[PDB]
């Protein structure tokens, strides 16, 4: 940068999709419990279909 000799970084650029300095609560995180419940209930459904 022009005025600050100490401003430098690496080629790596990115972002965390977080809320207020926390770890990111992703979309998959907030859909995962429902997917697990779906899998368990469909397990019951399949075992019912077998019997």
């Amino acid at each position: 940068r022009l005025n600050n000799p100490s401003r430098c970084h690496f080629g790596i650029v990115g972002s965390i999709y977080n809320l207020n300095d926390s770890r990111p609560f992703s979309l998959v995180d907030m859909m995962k419990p429902y997917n697990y419940l779906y899998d368990a209930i469909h397990d019951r459904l399949n075992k019912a279909i077998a019997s």
Binding site: N46, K47, I49, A50, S51
Partner: protein, 226 residues
């Protein structure tokens, strides 16, 4: 059946019957007949001995073992394919398919000319003397005791040497113990319920365990995960 068929000799039943002063004219000779009658009338398959014995078919006919009472399966020796009941009315009669069989006496009528067939049959467990050998299950023993007592009391009632109330009580008790004995020998054990469970739950139904010797009937049905 939950319990095991431990064998004991026939006069174990005469130990118990002869406790009754009115049954003291009973004999081993009478116990044999009534025991065989009870065995047949109950028709429990756990009381018989499972045997397998190969025979030759000369021409649509084969000689049957001496001790055979009932056949579980017949199959071809070389292939292992089981045979079914013969519905054909002119089996080996010519004019001018799959194999099957039919058994009447000492002779088994198959639809095949010259092959060896394996017969899995049930017989009676015998004693060192050539006599029937009974389970020592006290439910079975009590039910056989009550059967013989009921028959003896029925004769004595036909004479008029027993009260009708006494025979009515004997018939009631024998009936209850007969039902209980039927349920004792037939209700599956834990291993037999695992086999029944593995027969019951199939996502892909298995409908060809007759072809095998029902070997895979209680095998669990695994589905791969995708």
């Amino acid at each position: 059946m939950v319990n095991n068929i431990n064998w004991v000799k026939l006069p174990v039943i005469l130990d118990r019957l002869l406790r009754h002063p009115l049954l003291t004219d009973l004999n081993l000779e009478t116990a044999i007949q009534y025991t065989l009658d009870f065995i047949s009338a109950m028709g429990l398959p756990n009381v018989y001995v499972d045997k397998i014995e190969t025979i030759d078919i000369k021409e649509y006919r084969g000689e049957l073992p001496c001790d055979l009472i009932s056949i579980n399966q017949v199959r071809l020796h070389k292939n292992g394919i089981a045979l079914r009941a013969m519905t054909d009315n002119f089996n080996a009669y010519p004019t001018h398919g799959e194999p099957s069989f039919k058994t009447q006496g000492r002779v088994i009528f198959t639809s095949i000319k010259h092959e060896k067939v394996d017969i899995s049959y049930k017989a009676i467990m015998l004693d060192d003397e050539g006599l029937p050998l009974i389970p020592d299950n006290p439910i079975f023993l009590k039910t056989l005791e009550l059967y013989i007592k009921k028959e003896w009391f029925t004769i004595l009632f036909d004479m008029g040497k027993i009260s009708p109330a006494v025979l009515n009580n004997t018939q009631q008790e024998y009936a209850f113990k007969a039902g209980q004995c039927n349920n004792e020998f037939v209700i599956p054990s834990v291993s037999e319920m695992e086999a029944i469970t593995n027969m019951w739950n199939q996502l892909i139904p298995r409908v060809t365990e007759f072809r095998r010797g029902f070997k895979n009937l209680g095998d669990k049905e695994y589905i791969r995960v995708h």
